[PDB]
Amino acid sequence: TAPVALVTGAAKRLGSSIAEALHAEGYTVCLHYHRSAADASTLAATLNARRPNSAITVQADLSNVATASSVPVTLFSRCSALVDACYMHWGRCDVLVNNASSFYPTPLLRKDKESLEVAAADLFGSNAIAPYFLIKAFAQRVADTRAEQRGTSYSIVNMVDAMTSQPLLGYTMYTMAKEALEGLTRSAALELASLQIRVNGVSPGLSVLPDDMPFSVQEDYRRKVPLYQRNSSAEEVSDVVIFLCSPKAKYITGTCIKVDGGYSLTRA
Amino acid sequence: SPTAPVALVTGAAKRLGSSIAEALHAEGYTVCLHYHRSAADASTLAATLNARRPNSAITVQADLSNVATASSVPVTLFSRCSALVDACYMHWGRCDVLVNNASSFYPTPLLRKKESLEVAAADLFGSNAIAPYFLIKAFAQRVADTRAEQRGTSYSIVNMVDAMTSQPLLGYTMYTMAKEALEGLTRSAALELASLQIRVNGVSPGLSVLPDDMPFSVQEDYRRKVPLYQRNSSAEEVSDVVIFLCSPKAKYITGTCIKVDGGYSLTRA
Amino acid sequence: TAPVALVTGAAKRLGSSIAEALHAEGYTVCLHYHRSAADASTLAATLNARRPNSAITVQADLSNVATASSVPVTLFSRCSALVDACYMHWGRCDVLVNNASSFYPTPLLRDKESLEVAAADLFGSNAIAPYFLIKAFAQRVADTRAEQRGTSYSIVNMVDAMTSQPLLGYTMYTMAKEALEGLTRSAALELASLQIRVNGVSPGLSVLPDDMPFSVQEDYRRKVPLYQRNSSAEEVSDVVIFLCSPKAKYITGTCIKVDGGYSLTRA
Amino acid sequence: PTAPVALVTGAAKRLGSSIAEALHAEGYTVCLHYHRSAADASTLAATLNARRPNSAITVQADLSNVATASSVPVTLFSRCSALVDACYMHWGRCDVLVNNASSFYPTPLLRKKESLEVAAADLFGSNAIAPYFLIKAFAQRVADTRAEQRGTSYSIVNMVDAMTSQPLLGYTMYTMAKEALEGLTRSAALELASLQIRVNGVSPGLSVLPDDMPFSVQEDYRRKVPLYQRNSSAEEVSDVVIFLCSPKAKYITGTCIKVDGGYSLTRA
Ligand SMILES: NC(=O)C1=CN([C@@H]2O[C@H](COP(=O)(O)OP(=O)(O)OC[C@H]3O[C@@H](n4cnc5c(N)ncnc54)[C@H](OP(=O)(O)O)[C@@H]3O)[C@@H](O)[C@H]2O)C=CC1
Ligand SMILES: NC(=O)C1=CN([C@@H]2O[C@H](COP(=O)(O)OP(=O)(O)OC[C@H]3O[C@@H](n4cnc5c(N)ncnc54)[C@H](OP(=O)(O)O)[C@@H]3O)[C@@H](O)[C@H]2O)C=CC1
Ligand SMILES: NC(=O)C1=CN([C@@H]2O[C@H](COP(=O)(O)OP(=O)(O)OC[C@H]3O[C@@H](n4cnc5c(N)ncnc54)[C@H](OP(=O)(O)O)[C@@H]3O)[C@@H](O)[C@H]2O)C=CC1
Ligand SMILES: NC(=O)C1=CN([C@@H]2O[C@H](COP(=O)(O)OP(=O)(O)OC[C@H]3O[C@@H](n4cnc5c(N)ncnc54)[C@H](OP(=O)(O)O)[C@@H]3O)[C@@H](O)[C@H]2O)C=CC1
Ligand SMILES: CN(Cc1cnc2nc(N)nc(N)c2n1)c1ccc(C(=O)N[C@@H](CCC(=O)O)C(=O)O)cc1
Ligand SMILES: CN(Cc1cnc2nc(N)nc(N)c2n1)c1ccc(C(=O)N[C@@H](CCC(=O)O)C(=O)O)cc1
Ligand SMILES: CN(Cc1cnc2nc(N)nc(N)c2n1)c1ccc(C(=O)N[C@@H](CCC(=O)O)C(=O)O)cc1
Ligand SMILES: CN(Cc1cnc2nc(N)nc(N)c2n1)c1ccc(C(=O)N[C@@H](CCC(=O)O)C(=O)O)cc1
């Protein structure tokens, strides 16, 4: 049976890329998404096209809140349902890629109590709390699975950020969530090491800029990166993921790989 | 109208919080001792302190876990945290130093042997990270909401973190995650509040006053692991770094974490 | 024409594993060595047996000391000469892997001759040599007319994942690796213009010495969080092939650990 | 009983001079080392001696990794031992060591020999190799001192650089030497904790800028520092040294304190 892989935020951009790659490597993918249901399916189509039954599409709000079912469903629940939506269909889940991520200002000063305490649940859920549970569910299912019938390449990859050291002004929560994630990587790696589950992170610097920001803006940004003076492509990033998941890196765990074109070496 | 500096120390009830608060009080600060369940010890401290200097200490109970408390609508962590910064302004009309000391410290295995989780997820992250976030925020605004002329001259925020978070203690994943989120907060906060001359740093203890209940045999096991003096640090040693960062001897220091581990994080397995 | 890779200390153990791996990817390899002449040749033999003129050898003490000849040859000279050997023979040098490394105690607390020499040896092979080498290497890429340059210049520095937790008694060694780490980031930033990536691979525990009592060996391997065993040479070399592969072309000035989680442990 | 001795290298001017003074005013008897500023060394020695008789001396040595003329040429190590010897041979004690002396100039990889070989020795020598030796000489004396005749506060302090994670373009040799000095700090701290010798580093960001640097150059550097938009004074740096040597930091070892004003928190 082919290896299965869950990729949160597989709808568009990077997550979309990481999924294909894993698919191309011969992985049945569980394409996760939040708002974009179009792309999440447009993709699954193409994927199943290329190879019959090789891509499903689970949907879930990964923010740290509760959605209506009688009792509301916590974030833990929703998460434990994804990992669960795999063993249910393909009977296995070998690779998890916490990609899903909210990213926007959370200033400390100014120029709405709730906008914040909802962003907190947002930024902190997608980037850190959700990954914790996901990693936990994934780790249990393997634990439960009998020794004799376990996969041989369980790999977990959290998508962090290579610039958190030099915090992006005004993005406090995001930054905390991210560094909270790195800790998750390290901690997960050490503990889950026994079940032979690897946990590593990929720290992109300036990858595919937001489909939103203008051109003059993207220019100003990509021109700050030392290598090539351009942001990375979805590929230059996903390769690091497929590499981390391939056997060519089976002795690697609890580590983060920067893919920033030397961006983190620059100073103001 | 000179008036004495105010310091808000969360978890100032006992152990390190108490040491830090007493240390600050001793330097001349008036202190708002926050606590959660140690109502009696916090009162004892305050008592001791107000006997030395009248009206130089007050207490404030408040659960820093990221949940809501009963009041019309229940009260959110955000709100409760604003109440704290406000206590100082309401009582002394100022707040110059904040020390995020309050921290829940317990295991949260990824494997088996529910609700226990969701509470620990709100308790560990709220106390060690989210609460510190709202506090630094509220503390920062008041500074801004204050006239350039009536502004203190030594605003200092100190986040109590962990020096061993790089070598994750087995089983404490959320705590570890939270401590490092707190590190991000330290760096991020420092960068963003520089403009208001509010310094933000962290004190990273290795092994200080060991947990209250852990037995002798278990403790002395931990002491032989510290390269320097083969012991854990006293409270006075940890709190001494805290007074340093709040003194004008450190005014140009911000966004940094000072280790007080005795070399412990240099050791390998 | 086929890519060239210069691997210092490629005589045995890991360098031998890295050299052989690059060779497999199609790289033509220059196997430098210091004392291990026998092993280096045996390897060049095997490699040139799988493909004619796919490997050559070069001997050089990378210790920061002056050598024989007329006038003494500085470490710089030997270094630059090492790079020129690749250009003289295959007319191109694309990958440089600083692997050569002296590794032994230099206790702070106790003659002095021993010290002056450990300093030159330990800092020579781990930092000074790598510097000069990178420098000679970059010079060549620069002196090449834009049109003729290679499309994949990659430099990889072999460092250590346990430098943050100093191995008691190896100060000079630890100091040198830290300098090697600095070299990686500094060179990386300064060579980005020339499209020359500079990265590091930091193993934790791999192919233990050789003169390590099986008791002592099994000691260390039960300390490793993943598989409770040290790594293989191949597990460290896969990282090098990856860093030089085009699938890492946007990576530079970074270090990738291959410790199996060993650096995540405390005492 | 006696006054603590503090050996400060390159203590003739700037930061060094500020440290020797700060240490002196705390009660320490200081040994002012210099390379070329023999004049400044003297003005300072006179001043420190005027406030207190025989409370400071000067010692000249080239901390660069090159031999000098006396029978045989003197190695860097010899000179380093002579620096510590000087302290014991005058006060019978050496309690504090501040590795402040440091060469700092470009060593560009690309063209634009003997010019490098001398630079390599000077840079690495002063910034890393000498410090290793001075620490060694300093440590052996304590070791060859009976447990009871030992002081109650051995404190070594190395002046490092908070901006090495973001290498100053063109200064590779310098940057490596500092990283080396950083390793020295961690390693020496671990191996000297048994002798109760604390070893820490002070990481300045922008302090007394190198002179002959046009006002406009200095001003455009300061405007980059998040806090106060100015470089620090020498006092703001020495204040951190005096703290590390105080019993207020008696449990602190193997760490580096930044005094950069957040400048290392920024990004390009
Ligand atoms: N792109 C870059 O330049 C960089 C990216 N990174 C990291 O890479 C990872 C992916 O980045 P990038 O590809 O730009 O991200 P995308 O911007 O392409 O967004 C990924 C998405 O995951 C989903 N998501 C967002 N919030 C939530 C939530 N609360 N619950 C559930 N799902 C949510 C969304 O799905 P949607 O389809 O459903 O609505 C969102 O579009 C992140 O962890 C990011 O921080 C780091 C540095 C740089
Ligand atoms: N001492 C040590 O060995 C080490 C300490 N540290 C860090 O130092 C700081 C203090 O450590 P230490 O002195 O041991 O801590 P203590 O064990 O002092 O506990 C601090 C306390 O703050 C309060 N608190 C905990 N959870 C909550 C919550 N959810 N809401 C409100 N208040 C809460 C509690 O109050 P309570 O009395 O009022 O009810 C608790 O006693 C922490 O940040 C800790 O993580 C790091 C490494 C080691
Ligand atoms: N082994 C491990 O588990 C670990 C390895 N590393 C790093 O990986 C790399 C390879 O380590 P490992 O495989 O054990 O190394 P070995 O390769 O043990 O030795 C490499 C060699 O390079 C050469 N060399 C040593 N000193 C000098 C010198 N002064 N001048 C010139 N050449 C010299 C020698 O050549 P010789 O044969 O020709 O004469 C020596 O055999 C190193 O950089 C090491 O620091 C890091 C952590 C762990
Ligand atoms: N100034 C700043 O803003 C920053 C400083 N730092 C660190 O602070 C420390 C002091 O910096 P700064 O105050 O600018 O230094 P100074 O520029 O004041 O120079 C210190 C000196 O020590 C001596 N010295 C230098 N090279 C050698 C050598 N090869 N042999 C013997 N003596 C030598 C010289 O003595 P001389 O009088 O005798 O001839 C030299 O003037 C350094 O370690 C530096 O790396 C880090 C970041 C920023
Ligand atoms: C790559 N970089 C793009 C980018 C695109 N999507 C992402 N998505 C996630 N989840 N995480 C990221 N780190 C991320 N990064 C950036 C960097 C800064 C700003 C930015 O600052 N934007 C503000 C303006 C700046 C401000 O708040 O001061 C805006 O909303 O227009 C935008 C994109
Ligand atoms: C200093 N060190 C003590 C200590 C005391 N109070 C604190 N309080 C806070 N908020 N944060 C800390 N880091 C902290 N640390 C430690 C380290 C590990 C264990 C520990 O592992 N305890 C488990 C046993 C181990 C396990 O879960 O495997 C138990 O509950 O008995 C306890 C105290
Ligand atoms: C993987 N590890 C092996 C090892 C093998 N070759 C290497 N070669 C190089 N160039 N670099 C390395 N880091 C390296 N590491 C180790 C670690 C510690 C000791 C060790 O401490 N050996 C002393 C004993 C310990 C002591 O000095 O206290 C001895 O010479 O027997 C040996 C091998
Ligand atoms: C604080 N900062 C000053 C400064 C002054 N003295 C020092 N002295 C020592 N020993 N160490 C330092 N880090 C140091 N730093 C700086 C930073 C960069 C340049 C600089 O780049 N100078 C070149 C110009 C730039 C280049 O080579 O591209 C020159 O010589 O004019 C100078 C001073």
JSON list of N, CA, C and O and ligand atoms in Angstrom, two decimals, chain D residues 14 102-104 106 161 168-169 171 174 178 205-210 213 221, ligand 8:
[
{"chain": "D", "resi": 14, "resn": "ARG", "atom": "N", "xyz": [39.12, 54.00, 24.69]},
{"chain": "D", "resi": 14, "resn": "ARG", "atom": "CA", "xyz": [37.77, 53.58, 24.40]},
{"chain": "D", "resi": 14, "resn": "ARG", "atom": "C", "xyz": [37.16, 52.64, 25.43]},
{"chain": "D", "resi": 14, "resn": "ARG", "atom": "O", "xyz": [37.28, 52.87, 26.63]},
{"chain": "D", "resi": 102, "resn": "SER", "atom": "N", "xyz": [41.27, 44.07, 20.65]},
{"chain": "D", "resi": 102, "resn": "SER", "atom": "CA", "xyz": [40.78, 43.51, 19.39]},
{"chain": "D", "resi": 102, "resn": "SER", "atom": "C", "xyz": [41.06, 44.31, 18.10]},
{"chain": "D", "resi": 102, "resn": "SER", "atom": "O", "xyz": [40.77, 45.50, 18.02]},
{"chain": "D", "resi": 103, "resn": "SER", "atom": "N", "xyz": [41.63, 43.63, 17.11]},
{"chain": "D", "resi": 103, "resn": "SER", "atom": "CA", "xyz": [41.90, 44.26, 15.82]},
{"chain": "D", "resi": 103, "resn": "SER", "atom": "C", "xyz": [40.61, 44.14, 15.00]},
{"chain": "D", "resi": 103, "resn": "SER", "atom": "O", "xyz": [39.87, 43.16, 15.14]},
{"chain": "D", "resi": 104, "resn": "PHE", "atom": "N", "xyz": [40.34, 45.12, 14.14]},
{"chain": "D", "resi": 104, "resn": "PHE", "atom": "CA", "xyz": [39.10, 45.10, 13.38]},
{"chain": "D", "resi": 104, "resn": "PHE", "atom": "C", "xyz": [39.16, 45.81, 12.03]},
{"chain": "D", "resi": 104, "resn": "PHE", "atom": "O", "xyz": [38.98, 47.03, 11.94]},
{"chain": "D", "resi": 106, "resn": "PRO", "atom": "N", "xyz": [38.63, 44.99, 7.41]},
{"chain": "D", "resi": 106, "resn": "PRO", "atom": "CA", "xyz": [38.22, 44.15, 6.29]},
{"chain": "D", "resi": 106, "resn": "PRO", "atom": "C", "xyz": [39.22, 43.09, 5.86]},
{"chain": "D", "resi": 106, "resn": "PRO", "atom": "O", "xyz": [40.42, 43.29, 5.92]},
{"chain": "D", "resi": 161, "resn": "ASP", "atom": "N", "xyz": [30.76, 40.20, 20.00]},
{"chain": "D", "resi": 161, "resn": "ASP", "atom": "CA", "xyz": [30.10, 41.07, 19.05]},
{"chain": "D", "resi": 161, "resn": "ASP", "atom": "C", "xyz": [28.69, 40.57, 18.78]},
{"chain": "D", "resi": 161, "resn": "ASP", "atom": "O", "xyz": [28.51, 39.47, 18.27]},
{"chain": "D", "resi": 168, "resn": "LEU", "atom": "N", "xyz": [29.20, 41.42, 9.10]},
{"chain": "D", "resi": 168, "resn": "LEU", "atom": "CA", "xyz": [29.46, 42.72, 8.48]},
{"chain": "D", "resi": 168, "resn": "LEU", "atom": "C", "xyz": [30.16, 42.36, 7.19]},
{"chain": "D", "resi": 168, "resn": "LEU", "atom": "O", "xyz": [31.25, 41.79, 7.21]},
{"chain": "D", "resi": 169, "resn": "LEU", "atom": "N", "xyz": [29.54, 42.67, 6.07]},
{"chain": "D", "resi": 169, "resn": "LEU", "atom": "CA", "xyz": [30.09, 42.35, 4.76]},
{"chain": "D", "resi": 169, "resn": "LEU", "atom": "C", "xyz": [31.56, 42.75, 4.61]},
{"chain": "D", "resi": 169, "resn": "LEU", "atom": "O", "xyz": [31.93, 43.90, 4.84]},
{"chain": "D", "resi": 171, "resn": "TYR", "atom": "N", "xyz": [34.13, 41.51, 6.39]},
{"chain": "D", "resi": 171, "resn": "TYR", "atom": "CA", "xyz": [34.91, 41.22, 7.58]},
{"chain": "D", "resi": 171, "resn": "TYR", "atom": "C", "xyz": [34.86, 39.75, 8.01]},
{"chain": "D", "resi": 171, "resn": "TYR", "atom": "O", "xyz": [34.57, 39.44, 9.17]},
{"chain": "D", "resi": 174, "resn": "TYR", "atom": "N", "xyz": [37.53, 38.63, 10.84]},
{"chain": "D", "resi": 174, "resn": "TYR", "atom": "CA", "xyz": [37.08, 39.20, 12.10]},
{"chain": "D", "resi": 174, "resn": "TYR", "atom": "C", "xyz": [35.93, 38.38, 12.67]},
{"chain": "D", "resi": 174, "resn": "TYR", "atom": "O", "xyz": [36.00, 37.88, 13.77]},
{"chain": "D", "resi": 178, "resn": "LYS", "atom": "N", "xyz": [35.59, 36.17, 16.28]},
{"chain": "D", "resi": 178, "resn": "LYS", "atom": "CA", "xyz": [34.64, 36.44, 17.35]},
{"chain": "D", "resi": 178, "resn": "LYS", "atom": "C", "xyz": [33.84, 35.21, 17.70]},
{"chain": "D", "resi": 178, "resn": "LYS", "atom": "O", "xyz": [33.60, 34.93, 18.87]},
{"chain": "D", "resi": 205, "resn": "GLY", "atom": "N", "xyz": [26.75, 46.39, 20.51]},
{"chain": "D", "resi": 205, "resn": "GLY", "atom": "CA", "xyz": [26.16, 46.53, 19.18]},
{"chain": "D", "resi": 205, "resn": "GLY", "atom": "C", "xyz": [26.91, 47.68, 18.53]},
{"chain": "D", "resi": 205, "resn": "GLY", "atom": "O", "xyz": [27.75, 47.49, 17.65]},
{"chain": "D", "resi": 206, "resn": "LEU", "atom": "N", "xyz": [26.61, 48.88, 19.01]},
{"chain": "D", "resi": 206, "resn": "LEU", "atom": "CA", "xyz": [27.27, 50.08, 18.54]},
{"chain": "D", "resi": 206, "resn": "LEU", "atom": "C", "xyz": [27.69, 50.93, 19.74]},
{"chain": "D", "resi": 206, "resn": "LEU", "atom": "O", "xyz": [26.85, 51.55, 20.39]},
{"chain": "D", "resi": 207, "resn": "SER", "atom": "N", "xyz": [28.97, 50.91, 20.07]},
{"chain": "D", "resi": 207, "resn": "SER", "atom": "CA", "xyz": [29.48, 51.74, 21.17]},
{"chain": "D", "resi": 207, "resn": "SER", "atom": "C", "xyz": [30.46, 52.71, 20.56]},
{"chain": "D", "resi": 207, "resn": "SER", "atom": "O", "xyz": [30.69, 52.67, 19.35]},
{"chain": "D", "resi": 208, "resn": "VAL", "atom": "N", "xyz": [31.04, 53.59, 21.38]},
{"chain": "D", "resi": 208, "resn": "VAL", "atom": "CA", "xyz": [32.01, 54.56, 20.87]},
{"chain": "D", "resi": 208, "resn": "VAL", "atom": "C", "xyz": [32.49, 54.15, 19.48]},
{"chain": "D", "resi": 208, "resn": "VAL", "atom": "O", "xyz": [33.44, 53.39, 19.33]},
{"chain": "D", "resi": 209, "resn": "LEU", "atom": "N", "xyz": [31.79, 54.65, 18.45]},
{"chain": "D", "resi": 209, "resn": "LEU", "atom": "CA", "xyz": [32.13, 54.32, 17.07]},
{"chain": "D", "resi": 209, "resn": "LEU", "atom": "C", "xyz": [33.61, 54.62, 16.80]},
{"chain": "D", "resi": 209, "resn": "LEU", "atom": "O", "xyz": [34.18, 55.55, 17.37]},
{"chain": "D", "resi": 210, "resn": "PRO", "atom": "N", "xyz": [34.23, 53.84, 15.90]},
{"chain": "D", "resi": 210, "resn": "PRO", "atom": "CA", "xyz": [35.65, 54.02, 15.57]},
{"chain": "D", "resi": 210, "resn": "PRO", "atom": "C", "xyz": [35.78, 55.42, 15.06]},
{"chain": "D", "resi": 210, "resn": "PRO", "atom": "O", "xyz": [35.06, 55.82, 14.15]},
{"chain": "D", "resi": 213, "resn": "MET", "atom": "N", "xyz": [35.66, 58.50, 11.61]},
{"chain": "D", "resi": 213, "resn": "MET", "atom": "CA", "xyz": [34.49, 58.09, 10.85]},
{"chain": "D", "resi": 213, "resn": "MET", "atom": "C", "xyz": [33.66, 59.37, 10.82]},
{"chain": "D", "resi": 213, "resn": "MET", "atom": "O", "xyz": [33.17, 59.83, 11.85]},
{"chain": "D", "resi": 221, "resn": "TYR", "atom": "N", "xyz": [24.50, 55.59, 11.21]},
{"chain": "D", "resi": 221, "resn": "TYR", "atom": "CA", "xyz": [24.64, 54.28, 11.83]},
{"chain": "D", "resi": 221, "resn": "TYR", "atom": "C", "xyz": [23.69, 54.27, 13.03]},
{"chain": "D", "resi": 221, "resn": "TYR", "atom": "O", "xyz": [22.90, 53.35, 13.22]},
{"chain": "E", "resi": 8, "resn": "LIG", "atom": "C1", "xyz": [30.61, 50.10, 15.52]},
{"chain": "E", "resi": 8, "resn": "LIG", "atom": "N1", "xyz": [31.02, 49.96, 14.08]},
{"chain": "E", "resi": 8, "resn": "LIG", "atom": "C2", "xyz": [32.39, 50.46, 14.77]},
{"chain": "E", "resi": 8, "resn": "LIG", "atom": "C3", "xyz": [33.47, 49.64, 15.53]},
{"chain": "E", "resi": 8, "resn": "LIG", "atom": "C4", "xyz": [34.65, 50.49, 15.99]},
{"chain": "E", "resi": 8, "resn": "LIG", "atom": "N2", "xyz": [35.83, 49.74, 16.51]},
{"chain": "E", "resi": 8, "resn": "LIG", "atom": "C5", "xyz": [35.80, 48.39, 16.70]},
{"chain": "E", "resi": 8, "resn": "LIG", "atom": "N3", "xyz": [36.92, 47.77, 17.24]},
{"chain": "E", "resi": 8, "resn": "LIG", "atom": "C6", "xyz": [36.95, 46.41, 17.48]},
{"chain": "E", "resi": 8, "resn": "LIG", "atom": "N4", "xyz": [38.08, 45.79, 17.96]},
{"chain": "E", "resi": 8, "resn": "LIG", "atom": "N5", "xyz": [35.82, 45.66, 17.16]},
{"chain": "E", "resi": 8, "resn": "LIG", "atom": "C7", "xyz": [34.64, 46.23, 16.60]},
{"chain": "E", "resi": 8, "resn": "LIG", "atom": "N6", "xyz": [33.57, 45.47, 16.29]},
{"chain": "E", "resi": 8, "resn": "LIG", "atom": "C8", "xyz": [34.59, 47.63, 16.34]},
{"chain": "E", "resi": 8, "resn": "LIG", "atom": "N7", "xyz": [33.47, 48.26, 15.77]},
{"chain": "E", "resi": 8, "resn": "LIG", "atom": "C9", "xyz": [31.62, 49.98, 12.70]},
{"chain": "E", "resi": 8, "resn": "LIG", "atom": "C10", "xyz": [30.98, 49.16, 11.70]},
{"chain": "E", "resi": 8, "resn": "LIG", "atom": "C11", "xyz": [31.46, 49.03, 10.32]},
{"chain": "E", "resi": 8, "resn": "LIG", "atom": "C12", "xyz": [32.62, 49.85, 9.88]},
{"chain": "E", "resi": 8, "resn": "LIG", "atom": "C13", "xyz": [33.20, 49.77, 8.50]},
{"chain": "E", "resi": 8, "resn": "LIG", "atom": "O1", "xyz": [32.65, 49.04, 7.73]},
{"chain": "E", "resi": 8, "resn": "LIG", "atom": "N8", "xyz": [34.35, 50.46, 8.07]},
{"chain": "E", "resi": 8, "resn": "LIG", "atom": "C14", "xyz": [35.11, 50.48, 6.72]},
{"chain": "E", "resi": 8, "resn": "LIG", "atom": "C15", "xyz": [34.10, 50.72, 5.57]},
{"chain": "E", "resi": 8, "resn": "LIG", "atom": "C16", "xyz": [33.12, 49.55, 5.16]},
{"chain": "E", "resi": 8, "resn": "LIG", "atom": "C17", "xyz": [33.60, 48.30, 4.31]},
{"chain": "E", "resi": 8, "resn": "LIG", "atom": "O2", "xyz": [34.86, 47.62, 4.53]},
{"chain": "E", "resi": 8, "resn": "LIG", "atom": "O3", "xyz": [32.82, 47.88, 3.43]},
{"chain": "E", "resi": 8, "resn": "LIG", "atom": "C18", "xyz": [36.30, 51.53, 6.80]},
{"chain": "E", "resi": 8, "resn": "LIG", "atom": "O4", "xyz": [37.42, 51.13, 7.19]},
{"chain": "E", "resi": 8, "resn": "LIG", "atom": "O5", "xyz": [36.06, 52.76, 6.55]},
{"chain": "E", "resi": 8, "resn": "LIG", "atom": "C19", "xyz": [33.25, 50.67, 10.80]},
{"chain": "E", "resi": 8, "resn": "LIG", "atom": "C20", "xyz": [32.81, 50.77, 12.20]}
]
